[PDB]
């Protein structure tokens, strides 16, 4: 019965990077932060994608080798996952927590894609432990 | 279904990933980014749980200053750098249980009466639990 933009943690207190950063940038806000994955915005702060960790991993694993050096050559644009789950900032829960069973973290976005915040794993396990409480 | 253990509904250890103390940073990161895992649980050949490393623990660990410090990788072992203040659960143990402890924890390791590594209990399986019966 509630909806996913009450339960969501808003974009102000999310970390995200731009489509226009490189790959180093982006390595290192993952890093400081503790994200495995983070949002990624242009400068209208419109939803473009997620991009994680492995991906820039991945992206510059060679043959035989981590090519670290390469990051800041790289823009998040080039690696990112464009094709991702989204959430609006008025739909329902369980639409919400049909869609976390897979994603630590859904991106909720307005109607313009404008970013609004994630709706976490964590906030439907929470909310899910005191509906068994409740029996 | 509350009546359910944490071992009937965890991934077995056998289908899960994982490293040995003495590895270094840069077999881990392999590991890691080969398979997909964001962090993956250090055993011993006895199959005892050490900790858990993961990619975030190693980039942190080389990213200086200035520079990635990539040489570092094959100097620093695992379990230098891995988180060994782990939840733990026991695979006789209720699933509500488990169900607590993956609100703060994306996974959670499950042992056994001689503290072997069991498997994993995941936010995941859960969820999707939770959602078959809602």
Do not use: W
Not at 2 to 19: P, S
Not at 51 to 60: A, D, E, L, R
């Amino acid at each position: 019965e509630a909806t996913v933009g009450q339960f969501m943690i808003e974009a102000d207190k999310v970390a995200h990077v731009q489509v226009g950063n490189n790959l180093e940038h982006a390595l290192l806000v993952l890093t400081k932060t503790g994200y495995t994955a983070i949002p990624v915005l242009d400068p209208s702060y419109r939803l473009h994608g997620l991009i994680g960790t492995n991906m820039i991993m991945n992206s510059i694993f060679g043959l035989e080798r981590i090519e670290f050096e390469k990051l800041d050559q790289i823009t998040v644009e080039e690696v990112m996952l464009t094709d991702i789950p989204r959430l609006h900032i008025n739909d329902p829960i369980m639409k919400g927590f049909g869609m976390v069973i897979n994603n630590g973290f859904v991106c909720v976005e307005n109607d313009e894609q404008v970013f609004e915040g994630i709706f976490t794993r964590r906030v439907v396990l929470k909310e899910l432990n005191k509906h068994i409480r409740s029996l």
